[PDB]
């Protein structure tokens, strides 16, 4: 795939967390998990093309946690091959370094205490998986090569039974 | 299903740390979790922890956190378990299993077990 | 929160056991799973679920329950069949159960 997986970075971006980790919100504005989505309320449907499924994680066709209702976020593709994307606050870890990872996903060796429902945005459960669905290549045809699994997550109390595609 | 589970620590020391390990012969290592479950000379047995070694992610049960350090090495295709702050209590044996199927937060149930190594606390 | 009724349990081959778990508030969504120790090597897996049996364990252990009080009979005994049975639930709240003793020296 061009250009979009062979410079976007290492699976283990350096930097740790320094100590508490808090809430942040960059506005960063997605080949590869090292992005950054933005909260996005209200929003024109006009210009939205194709599915919207948005990850709960459970994929379903103003998103909010599922403690709190709604939806942790969900990309889409628009206009002229446009990808944009949306979730809750991403996820900052507080530490030093010249490119700290601001996690959209979990991430537990550059942090102890990173669990999904509380530091995850996006459909990327790690590093290296994804949650699967019917347009899970449309969105990022990097990503062609992993291995299907099955897989339980327990968020919150819930318990939620999904595939999830990893590398290996 | 072939476990060498080594025997780590046969005899220890009051408030020492013990590293005991178990290893996964043949199959493709990182797809099922290892589970380390404990039970006492006669007892019934206690769950004592867990790991996927993909979802780097371990599961410790809610009495043995803070203490219990379970780590997994994929080139070596080995899991260790380091435990710590020993107690005259901790005298069993420490055995190794498979999940059956992967889990994120919970446990589930032993496939094929391992040898049952015996780990005493003495003075 | 889980516990076994029987206690000790003591028979003669050519004979009914039952034994019960209780799963003590909730209901759980039907996760069991039930081990024979041998008084030396390490437990083994007859049931999980309570409904669908291992593989290479005979019919004679059966399983069954809903919402409660999940029960695994040891129906025509035999004289290898000495063994502590252990109950556990898994899923969100893993936890063993207590261990009923047998006797199959009669």
């Known amino acids: 795939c061009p250009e979009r997986m062979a410079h976007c970075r290492p699976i283990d971006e350096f930097a740790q967390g320094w100590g508490p980790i808090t809430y942040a919100e960059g506005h960063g504005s997605p080949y590869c998990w090292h992005y950054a989505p933005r909260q996005c309320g209200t929003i024109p449907a006009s210009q939205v093309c194709g599915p919207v499924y948005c990850f709960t994680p459970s994929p379903v066709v103003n998103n909010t946690r599922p403690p709190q209702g709604n939806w942790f976020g969900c990309t889409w593709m628009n206009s002229t091959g446009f990808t944009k994307t949306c979730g809750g606050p991403p996820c900052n870890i507080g530490g030093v370094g010249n490119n700290t990872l601001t996690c959209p996903t979990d991430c537990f060796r550059k942090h102890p205490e990173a669990t999904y429902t509380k530091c995850g945005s996006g459909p990327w459960l790690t590093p290296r998986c994804l949650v699967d669905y019917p347009y899970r290549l449309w969105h990022y045809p990097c990503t062609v090569n992993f291995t299907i699994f099955k897989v339980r997550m327990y968020v919150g109390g819930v318990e939620h039974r999904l595939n999830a595609a990893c590398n290996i | 299903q072939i476990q060498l589970v080594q025997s780590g620590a046969e005899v220890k020391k009051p408030g020492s740390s013990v590293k005991v390990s178990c290893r996964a012969s043949?199959?493709?290592?990182?797809?099922?979790?290892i589970t380390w479950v404990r039970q006492a000379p006669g007892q019934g047995l206690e769950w004592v922890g867990g790991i996927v070694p993909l979802f780097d992610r371990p599961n410790y049960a809610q009495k043995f956190q803070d203490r219990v350090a379970i780590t997994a090495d994929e080139s070596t295709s080995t899991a260790y378990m380091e435990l710590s702050s020993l107690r005259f209590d901790d005298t069993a044996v420490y055995y190794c299993?498979?999940?059956?199927?992967?889990?994120?937060?919970?446990?589930?149930?032993?496939?094929?077990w391992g040898q049952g190594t015996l780990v005493t606390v003495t003075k | 929160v889980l516990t076994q009724s029987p206690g000790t349990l003591s028979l003669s081959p050519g004979e009914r056991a039952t034994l019960s778990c209780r799963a003590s508030q909730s209901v759980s969504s039907t996760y069991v799973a039930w081990y024979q120790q041998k008084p030396g090597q390490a437990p083994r897996l007859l049931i999980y679920?309570?409904?669908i049996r291992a593989t290479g364990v005979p019919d004679r252990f059966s399983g069954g329950g809903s919402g409660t009080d999940f029960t695994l009979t040891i129906s025509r005994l035999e004289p290898e069949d000495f063994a502590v049975y252990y109950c556990?639930?898994?899923?969100?709240?893993?936890?063993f159960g207590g261990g009923t003793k047998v006797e199959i020296k009669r």
């Open positions: 299993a498979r999940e059956a199927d992967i889990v994120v937060g919970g446990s589930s149930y032993f496939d094929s």
């Open positions: 556990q639930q898994y899923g969100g709240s893993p936890f």
């Open positions: 679920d309570a409904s």
């Open positions: 043949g199959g493709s290592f990182g797809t099922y979790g």
